[PDB]
Amino acid sequence: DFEEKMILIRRTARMQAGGRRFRFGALVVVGDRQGRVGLGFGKAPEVPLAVQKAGYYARRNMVEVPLQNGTIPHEIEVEFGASKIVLKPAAPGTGVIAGAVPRAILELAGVTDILTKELGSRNPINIAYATMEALRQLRTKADVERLRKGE
Amino acid sequence: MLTDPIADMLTRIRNATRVYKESTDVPASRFKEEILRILAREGFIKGYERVDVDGKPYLRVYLKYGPRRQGPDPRPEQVIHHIRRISKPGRRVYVGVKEIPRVRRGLGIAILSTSKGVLTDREARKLGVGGELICEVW
Amino acid sequence: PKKVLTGVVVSDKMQKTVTVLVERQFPHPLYGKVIKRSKKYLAHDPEEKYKLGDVVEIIESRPISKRKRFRVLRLVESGRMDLVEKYLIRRQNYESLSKR
Amino acid sequence: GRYIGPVCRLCRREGVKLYLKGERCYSPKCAMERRPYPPGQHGQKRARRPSDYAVRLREKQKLRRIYGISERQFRNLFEEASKKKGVTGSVFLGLLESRLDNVVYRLGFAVSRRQARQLVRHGHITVNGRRVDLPSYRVRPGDEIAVAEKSRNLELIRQNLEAMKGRKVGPWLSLDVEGMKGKFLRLPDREDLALPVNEQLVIEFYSR
Amino acid sequence: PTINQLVRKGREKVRKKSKVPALKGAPFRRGVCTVVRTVTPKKPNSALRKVAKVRLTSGYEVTAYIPGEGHNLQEHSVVLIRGGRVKDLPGVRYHIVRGVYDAAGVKDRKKSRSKYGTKKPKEAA
RNA sequence: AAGGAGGUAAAAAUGGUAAAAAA
RNA sequence: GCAAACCGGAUUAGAUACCCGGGUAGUCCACGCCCUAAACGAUGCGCGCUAGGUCUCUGGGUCUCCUGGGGGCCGAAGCUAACG
RNA sequence: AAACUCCUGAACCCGGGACGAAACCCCCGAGGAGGGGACUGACGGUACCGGGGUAAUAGCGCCGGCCAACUCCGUGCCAGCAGCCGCGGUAAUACGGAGGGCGCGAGCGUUACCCGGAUUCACUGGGCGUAAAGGGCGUGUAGGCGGCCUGGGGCGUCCCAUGUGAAA
């Protein structure tokens, strides 16, 4: 019981010898609502194809979510080259104040109080990627205790 | 040469961290000794000692690593995530009490030299004494 | 109180009065870094007793004449040929910046 | 003014019913069950894709519309909500529910919003002594909504008090079908009055 | 720029230019005018647009437009210098109002009565 | 003899033709 | 010897141009004066750190090797929007 | 929604009715503290208290995407909207009209002005191989900043006290 929450659609033509052939790109984000997510872009001639296949790539491109009440446990300045996603902690009741893909992905993680600013290239592709790696670079007290105990 | 054997050290650190090479060397000084003191002292490096190369006193530093996971390549994660030299020889930061960062808001560490010696975020705020803001690390 | 300050002596050349380059410094209220700053004052020398360098602690007193403010109460040291040299070097680099 | 007129035309507009008008818009339709769905020449013509922001705005509306007031003062008291201390959202909800008019209504004296606000601005309510008009009057823990002396000998006031006896008031709504009063107790929560609305939507929205 | 150079110099403020010198704080002015004509916007139009030259009560021969169909305007009107260019008439800046001292909107308008003149369409029925 | 790269010689008689545009 | 400008020649619809015949400024020698550029590695300078495989030029060592300094290519990590 | 229904009762009629003002003053005490009596309303008989009682103003932008909301005729690159990108060149969801609806409501749009978004002069928070950019290059003045070790200094720096930072 995930959630196929489509983000948007892209239309990519290649200039046929006798015309032009577009193809659908399905930017999809898959959640669960409590704390698991995955990302996928669909690559297909007609829309639904792309949507489903995308949803499926989101299905296998997974990642966990550490929640405290409903916020981040710190502050990350993540940068997928072009884009630059930045998250900062907020108190309960604040709401999910974020951009497009930020709040989408994060509500498929089900955040509740996250101050988020998004800088640089706001290109939805690299935005999704930067986001995914921002939460894929989420450290917590637990993970701290692992390595900051010393092996 | 060198303008900051300190920040240069921090850099060689960043090398060994980002390259995964168990240990790395960095010349003789009392202050580096204080810093690396703090570093082991919060479970980060693997240690230090006053060594020597060619006849020149140095200070070698071994460092910490995590577990080797599979799937997306074998690359294990880092322990000494990142350190940033704050008070450059142009931005001579001088934090005090009510000042002081929070570093990753909760965890991390601030390294700062005060009236008495080399302190840390939580320490220096607990102490109630401040000074220059060296690096940040988490 | 009455503000005083130390400073490097410049020009004995005035009769019974000298000039003194004072130094202060401060960071940038928005751009970190401290900045070195020069500011000469009127070193009041009733019994002409300071010369070409003589760092002295100088005293803000009752007005003496045109801009004639400050004085001296006590001395620090002598023969500041170095800092004074830099002073005259600046003046030289001034006499090397023509628009004509 | 505060809209009025084609009201439970709003009931259908959201996609969820809202008593709003008692008796009938509470009966076999809040304009609903007959023909419930957003009004107009369109309406029942294939629902679409309202952006996240859109159903967010809608949530905001929805909320202000069940709270028979202007979105003006809805907003104003929202500002007042994030102003002082408290859990922004749920507290905001509470701050809405603490207003004299809905207090008079949910007490039972009124059978829904419009009637209620009429009665309230008609100064028929005496809290700790004084008859107050001033519909946007939020009381305080340690006060009590009463009815006027001649407003005891009153038609559908009595009819209300009659078709009410047995209908349990809120946990912070103290009833008094004897002294003809209504203690404003504690400070209620989304669990006390759950309306088809999300808090963080209205927040995130308003706090753009 | 390494802190030092930044301090020695300065990162100058953008400044503006006002793409709209209605000037004095006066974007409301007494459009005296002269001529009418037509003119065209790029490759897909052709219309009218006046030229109202205005003189304000400070100067300039501008290009004062009009709020559209329903005209009179002849040569005075007090064309109320307003503001807003488009891909039409190399100017379209400082529009007209209708109402002012003249024009008072389209003979029968049912919407933009906030400049297009007509009061309150009381059909008295 | 594979590729890729690094410097030396090869190779066009002639060409004017536009355009608001259709998806 | 060469060669802009300049003339003949042939070419084309035109040839003030490329191809051919002559021919000058100038390209050389010294003093001076101008100071420009794709002055191009389009990459400032100084240091320290971070895989190696190689072709080659100079400095040192008994030398199928090492080591100082440089000069082509490759490719860890890393970086870059991409080529790189 | 209207009409029909019952209810309440803005506006409005009559009546009573302010706080805003107790000091100054004479007097007993001494001209002091105290104690007494007396004067003092511009608003305005307005606030407001009681009773009598009538349903009793509705607009402004929009409906192409940004930015929430569509159907119908006309118009035919003409008339025209237009912050941006454009929309119309005879089946316009963008013009103009009409039903509906989105918003806002005693206000709604329009322009002007400023701050933001603009991290788009970047301190937090940018860049110089090819998009904007190395100065053709060597010299060095000042200036800028500076390797290991000890001790003095306590200028920068940190800490507690502290004067002032009025009021608003």
* Interface contact E11, partner C, CB < 8 A: no
Give the C-alpha separation, A78 to B86, whole Å: 19
For residue D204, list chain A residues with Cβ-Cβ distance below 8 A.
95-97
User: What is the SS3 string spanning chain D?
Assistant: CCCCCCCCHHHHHHCCCCCCCCCCCCECECCCCCCCCCCCCCCCCCCCCCCHHHHHHHHHHHHHHHCCCCHHHHHHHHHHHHHCCCCHHHHHHHHHHCEHHHHHHHHHHCCCHHHHHHHHHCCCEEECCEEECCCCCECCCCEEEEECCCCCCCHHHHHHHHCCCCCCCCCCECCECCCCEEEECCCCCCCCCCCCCCHHHHHHHHCC
B18 touches strand G (CB under 7 A): yes
Q: In E42-72, which positions are buried (b, 16+ CB within 10 angstroms) versus exposed (e)?
A: eeeeeeebbbbbbbbeeebebbbbbbbebbe
Q: In D10-37, which positions are buried (b, 16+ CB within 10 angstroms) versus exposed (e)?
A: bbbbbeebbbbbbeebbeebbbbeeebe
Domain match, A55 and A74 both? no
Give the single-character DSSP code of C97. -
Q: Which residue reads 């103290």 in tokens?
A: D174
Q: In C51-65, which positions are buried (b, 16+ CB within 10 angstroms) versus exposed (e)?
A: ebbbbbebbeeeeee
- Asked if D113 and D102 touch (Cβ cutoff 8 Å), the reply is yes
Interface contact A74-B106, CB threshold 8 A: yes
Burial of D107 (0-12, 13-18, 19+ CB in 10 A): buried
Lookup: nucleotide whose C1' is closest to C86 CA: H142
Q: Which residue is nearest to nucleotide H127 (CA to C1')?
A: E1
Write down the experimental method used for this entry: X-ray
- Asked if E64 and E50 touch (Cβ cutoff 8 Å), the reply is yes
CA angle (B113 as vertex; B66, B1 as ends), nearest 5: 80
Total domains in chain A come to 2
Distance in angstroms: CA D134, C1' H59: 25
For residue B88, list chain E residues with Cβ-Cβ distance below 8 A.
3
Instruction: State the CATH number of the domain containing residue A118.
Output: 3.30.230.10
Nearest partner of A39 among A106, A89, A137, A99, judged by Cα: A106
A with E: 3 or more CB pairs under 8 Å? no
* Interface contact C32, partner B, CB < 8 A: yes
When the candidates are 3.40.50.970, 1.10.1050.10, 1.10.10.10, 3.40.980.10, the CATH number that belongs to D1-96+194-208 is 1.10.1050.10
Give start and end residues of each alpha helix (H) in chain C.
81-94
| Chain centroid to CA E7 | 44
Give the C-alpha separation, D169 to D103, whole Å: 11
B78 touches strand G (CB under 7 A): no
Binding-site members of D for Zn(2+) are 8, 11, 25, 30
B with E: 3 or more CB pairs under 8 Å? yes
Interface contact D88-A104, CB threshold 8 A: no
The two tokens of residue A104 are 């989408």
Tell how many helices (H) and how many strands (E) occur in chain B: 3, 7
Determine the structural domain holding residue A47 and report its residue range.
3-63
**What is the phi/psi pair of residue A129, to 5°?**
-65, -55
Residue ending a domain, among A31, A48, A63, is A63
The two tokens of residue C68 are 């004639």
Domain boundary assignment for chain C? 1-100
What domains can be seen in chain E, in order of their start residue? 1-125 (2.40.50.140)
Instruction: Give CB contacts under 8 A, 24+ apart, made by A75-80.
Output: A75/B104, A75/B105, A76/A134, A76/A137, A76/A138, A78/A130, A78/A131, A78/A133, A78/A134, A78/A137, A79/A120, A79/A130, A80/A126, A80/A129, A80/A130, A80/A133
Instruction: State the CATH number of the domain containing residue A41.
Output: 3.30.160.20
Task: Give the architecture (CATH level 2) of C1-100.
Answer: Beta Barrel (2.40)
| Residues in CB range of B11: below 8 A, 6 or more apart | none
When the candidates are 3.30.1370.30, 1.10.3210.10, 3.90.380.10, 3.40.50.300, the CATH number that belongs to B3-80 is 3.30.1370.30
Searching chain A, which residue's CA lies closest to the CA of residue D88? A93
Domain match, A112 and A127 both? yes
CATH 3.30.1490.10 describes domain B81-138: yes
Rg (CA), chain D: 18
Nearest partner of C50 among C67, C32, C70, judged by Cα: C70
Distance from CA of C93 to the nearest CA of E (A): 18
Residue ending a domain, among A63, A94, A114, is A63
| Residues in CB range of A98: below 8 A, 6 or more apart | A106, A111, A114, A116, A118
A4, containing H or E segment? strand A4-11
Burial of D197 (0-12, 13-18, 19+ CB in 10 A): buried
Residue ending a domain, among A63, A88, A111, is A63
Torsion of CA E70, E76, E82, E84, to 10 degrees: 60
SS3 at position A13: coil
Task: Give the architecture (CATH level 2) of D97-193.
Answer: Roll (3.10)
**What is the phi/psi pair of residue D184, to 5°?**
-85, 100
